Amino acid sequence: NLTAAESRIRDVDMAKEMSEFTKNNILSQASQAMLAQANQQPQNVLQLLR
Amino acid sequence: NLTAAESRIRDVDMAKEMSEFTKNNILSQASQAMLAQANQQPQNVLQLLR
Secondary structure (H helix, E strand, O other): OHHHHHHHHHOOOHHHHHHHHHHHHHHHHHHHHHHHHHOOOHHHHHHHHO | OHHHHHHHHHOOOHHHHHHHHHHHHHHHHHHHHHHHHHOOOHHHHHHHHO
């Protein structure tokens, strides 16, 4: 019983934590794409200049 | 938030400032044309003399 409760404190649910991981890594790639889009506007400011 | 407010103090609106620039350079050319017209009268004063 004690080791079971220990586990319920400590035991990772690798399923949950890998869904969460997959998610978060994808959020990294996501936000990186958002920068890749964000930085594309000032060039059109140059087009305003010329 | 702070850097945003900084930007709202410092950030040029290149669009606005280029419309303004284009304008003002054209006002230079404008007034220069006005001199180019202004200086053409005294020759007709010579025509009065002869």
